[PDB]
Design a protein around this ligand. Sequence first.
Ligand SMILES: Nc1nc2c(c(=O)[nH]1)NC(CNc1ccc(C(=O)N[C@@H](CCC(=O)O)C(=O)O)cc1)CN2
Ligand SMILES: N[C@@H](CCS)C(=O)O
Ligand SMILES: [Zn+2]
Ligand SMILES: [Zn+2]
Length: 746
Amino acid sequence: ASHIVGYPRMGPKRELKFALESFWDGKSTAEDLQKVSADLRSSIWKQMSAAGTKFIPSNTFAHYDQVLDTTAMLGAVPPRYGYTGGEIGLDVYFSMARGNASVPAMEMTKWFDTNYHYIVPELGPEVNFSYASHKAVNEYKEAKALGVDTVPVLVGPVSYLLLSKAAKGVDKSFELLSLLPKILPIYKEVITELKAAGATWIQLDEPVLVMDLEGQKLQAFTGAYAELESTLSGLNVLVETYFADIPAEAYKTLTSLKGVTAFGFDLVRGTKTLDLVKAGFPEGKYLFAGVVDGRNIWANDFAASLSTLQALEGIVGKDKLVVSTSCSLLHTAVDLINETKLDDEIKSWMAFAAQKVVEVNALAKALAGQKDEALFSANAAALASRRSSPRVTNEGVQKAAAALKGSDHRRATNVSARLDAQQKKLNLPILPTTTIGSFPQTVELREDYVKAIKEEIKKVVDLQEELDIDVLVHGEPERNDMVEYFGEQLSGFAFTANGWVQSYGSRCVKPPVIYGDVSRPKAMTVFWSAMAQSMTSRPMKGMLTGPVTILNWSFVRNDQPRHETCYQIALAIKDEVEDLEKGGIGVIQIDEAALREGLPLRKSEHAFYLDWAVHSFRITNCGVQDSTQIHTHMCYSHFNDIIHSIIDMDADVITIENSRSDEKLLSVFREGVKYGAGIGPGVYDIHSPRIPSSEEIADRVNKMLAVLEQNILWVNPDCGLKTRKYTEVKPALKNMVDAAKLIRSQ
Ligand SMILES: Nc1nc2c(c(=O)[nH]1)NC(CNc1ccc(C(=O)N[C@@H](CCC(=O)O)C(=O)O)cc1)CN2
Ligand SMILES: N[C@@H](CCS)C(=O)O
Ligand SMILES: [Zn+2]
Ligand SMILES: [Zn+2]
């Protein structure tokens, strides 16, 4: 049998994207949107079954988020929204989702370790839970009436609570898992209506079981399914887990939960679970083998899969083994059959969702003796291509056996005995002003030199006149996507035409694709950066994108360990740094916006990640002078749990985030750490259109002088000004300089 754990909910050409925004625009109504949603929903079920898909999921579709879909299912709507009861419709739903013009929208956080963000529920002891949304049962019927039987996918009761958060007031000591009693009754009613409509299988998504859970929490799972058993009578229950391997303890709790008859394992990222199963599995319980990476974009190693699936068939195979995606296809793109610009051979090497739906089957039939030989013949051939094609392997893939020359710390020169030189070369005043990288746009017409400069010099003619700014920037005009920019200008980067993935709400991201060994044969920055530092007699911050960000925000190849690719990228950058140097750019800022992003969900693994991660950064500027100043830029307000790694990046002046945090948190530097190096946390919120005050800045900018060590303190924004209007930033920045001035004055 075959099974897909989840599917994208936007469309092949992002139909729901515009249908969604549209309704919110006010240029379309429910009826029309509903028309679209249901239509897309139909096309998916139809598309899925017609491929042979045995277990087709329903309820994966969402108007915004799945955890919200379940927040409405439990009527767990926040007070400030004014819900009185009854069936929750587009009003209350989209409120919570994106707020209205009188109340704010709920907080969204990252989905486990994915590039997806969900809407964290706000729970507490005073919320009145109720069956407020028949989306599940409704969709089940819709699919049945269309001729296709589906498996309702529900977010596990306990994962739901663990993923939630206690809303304001709820005293610190309140345990969220203390609500299992108020929510479980509702799960029952829902599970009852599904049995009632015909459902013969259900799916509780309990991904949190792949997390490091304490025995008391693991035990929380046990009490839920115990209490659920009766309602689960006569009904196959598939409990899904994904993104990592299951801890041996979690494996015990899982494989012994009540009513659960099937178990979903992510065997792409959690093959380590293979052992646990190899060493013991329930009897007549199913094992959905998640061997088809629904998380990347590459074809599957059909052969490999069969080996894995076969031995699995070994353990059981008595018809209890089901082929499945490693996780929800929500995390991969839709149709690779919308990838035109991409040459043949390369695409021959990729497979998006729709394509993956099919693989699951070629592998399901091949395990049932229906092995469509024409598929493996082609696959294996495409595998052959990739592993050979000189578009992959290289001699750059040799400059690596030299990076084994011990670490790559920036040439002894303790940053402290290095600042002494950087300053000399450019005498800057205490609390040096500056920006982050990007700048607001104008007309913006989608030669180019005569025009490009016109804008760059205005960006500079401004930086100068405008609030001095001890160090200006070129405002990244020539760069749309800070990661794409460099990809197009690189070796192992291909770009897809319609390969989109969702990020949150109606928003998405088309990540560059890293197919082979990265390499920068020609100068990328230099030109524009050099052109900029000549239009002034002030330090100019050269601009680069750290190799960790690039890696993360891009579909990296599943053939060699991340870092290995990360490093290749790190080396490529090492150039543009020593060229903006030769070129004559003094100060240079390298940014790592997505550094914490690639953090493994398994705690004993954070160490290894942060390792190659921060090292690859060094590898970028380890061949730089002692007078060449370096700035790193990360988009985080928290480093408390990763302050050491910041200390190992060896940045002369690191610029991070802040704006809406404490002035005291900054002592995570001045405590048992002793950073001792230019630090610059943001003093102006750029996601808040609204202008700040000269008075507001210079006081918090004083609450840094007294929490840090004003003597290595910088004055910069919060992040690039790319998404702020010139009118919102002009008065704004101006007030960020006056602050330093005064404060200095004394
Ligand atoms: N490589 C690259 N990848 C990225 C980012 C980047 O900086 N560069 N920044 C990221 C953080 N998340 C988001 C989520 C949504 C949007 C967004 O608003 N997207 C528009 C399209 C934006 C566009 O024109 O690109 C949409 O509606 O689909 C932008 C960043 C994620 N991935
Ligand atoms: N400075 C760059 C990278 C930060 S995300 C920018 O402003 O886009
Ligand atoms: Zn930032
Ligand atoms: Zn260290």
